[PDB]
């Protein structure tokens, strides 16, 4: 029943490890995460407002 969580929260944990193992991602790498957050989530009203919060954590970290 852990399917209601968007992959964003999963990528939060996963990218945390991935990025470190890669030795810090470059600017273009994050564009390969932005698409991975929602993929094609249709932009569900309210839901994506929630997704936006996770979006805010992946597009930048040292900035």
How is the chain split into domains, by residue range? 7-58
Can you point out the beta strands (E) in the chain? none
**What technique solved it?**
NMR
To which residue do tokens 């954590």 refer? 57
Instruction: Please tell me whether residue 52 adopts helix, strand or coil conformation.
Output: helix
Catalogue the long-range contacts made by 12-16 (C-beta closer than 8 Å, 24 or more residues apart). Answer: 12/54, 12/57, 12/58, 15/58
Alpha carbon separation from 23 to 17, 19, 26, 31 (Å, rounded): 10, 6, 9, 17
Stated as kind and residue range, the H or E segment containing 35 is helix 31-38
* Percentage helix, strand, coil for the chain under 3-state DSSP, each rounded to 5: 55, 0, 45
Largest CA distance in the chain: 36
């Amino acid at each position: 029943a852990d399917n209601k969580f968007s992959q964003s929260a999963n990528l939060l944990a996963e990218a945390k490890k991935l990025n470190d193992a890669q030795g810090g991602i470059t600017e273009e790498q994050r564009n390969g995460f932005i698409q991975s957050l929602k993929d094609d989530a249709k932009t569900n009203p309210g839901n994506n407002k929630e997704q936006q919060n996770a979006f805010y954590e992946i597009l930048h970290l040292p900035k």
